[PDB]
């Protein structure tokens, strides 16, 4: 029932020391604003997805600027073919295309 | 090498839905550091994680063939988060036209709200270890393909998965909503150091709807 002292100790035991190392270790970006404005109605679909979208895309531009500075290849090449999470037949059928 | 090393035990109880099974499969593809094991008291998950040498557990608990809970822990000393998962939509589904590399390392986007209270700050760190992909794990792939986002709306954690286009975004799935139920000191044991007073079980909710 909100033992803040123990959750504080749990965080310190368990967190990795990210400041002593490079952004590539974690690739995580925390937003500055609460993503709580951008939503006038918690129960409107298109409103909250837009906020989610915004928070994520802001995190991606930040992440690309940092991985560029670190010389870590970023964008998936159009001609790099590795196993994807969905098949190409699945993608083509979802778009109603001829395979 | 790198400082961030993670191996996550990915395991479920008996009784998971078809929809539940799909999410497990989605996370297994999205997390090359996960190790999917045969199905599973809950203290016995510390031994199983030591068998497969995992320092995290993602345990999906299904009840009544419809309610899905996620238990996230650090075996064998803890802590443990218990979440109630709702609004589940797997990457299977019609309106998700994003695709990404199986095993590429995602960007993680966190709401500023995660820095707002001690229980959110502990969850944030734990989600990074589990839903981030460690550099440069066995079965991981190069290039940055997609983002997994976490946002706090009506004190629930809303999770989305987006493919990075070129730069715009297109949703992959899966998609779901977690609400924190409790936090245990230990790993499926020890005292509760957090309880959500706003959480109510879906079995009570289903009953109060019958009562009309």
Residue numbers in the entry:
A (entry chain A): 195 to 293
B (entry chain D): 26 to 65, 70 to 195, 210 to 255
Question: Mind quoting what the paper says about this structure?
Answer:
Ribosome assembly is a highly complicated process that engages more than 200 protein assembly factors (AFs) and many snoRNAs. The earliest pre-60S ribosome is co-transcriptionally formed on the 3′ LSU region of pre-rRNA in a stepwise manner. The maturation of pre-60S is coupled to the dynamic association of approximately 90 assembly factors, hierarchical incorporation of RPLs and sequential processing of ITS1 and ITS2. In this study, we determine the cryo-EM structure of pre-60S at an early nucleolar state.
Brx1 is a Brix domain protein that interacts with Ebp2. We determined the crystal structure of Brx1 (residues 26–255) in complex with Ebp2 (residues 195–293) at 2.3 Å resolution with de novo phasing. Brx1 adopts an α/β fold with pseudo 2-fold symmetry, similar to other Brix domain proteins. The structural core of Brx1 is composed of two curved β-sheets that form a half-open β-barrel sandwiching two α-helices (α1 and α3). The surface of the N-terminal sheet holds helix α2, whereas the surface of the C-terminal sheet makes an intermolecular interaction with helix α2′ of Ebp2. In addition, the Ebp2 sequences that flank helix α2′ wrap around the Brx1 structure, forming an extensive interface. In the cryo-EM map, the Brx1-Ebp2 complex perfectly fits into a density bound to domain I. Brx1 interacts with a flat surface formed by H13 and H21. The position of Brx1 would clash with H68 and H88 in domains IV and V in the fully assembled 60S. Thus, the Brx1-Ebp2 complex must be released from the current position for ribosome assembly to proceed.
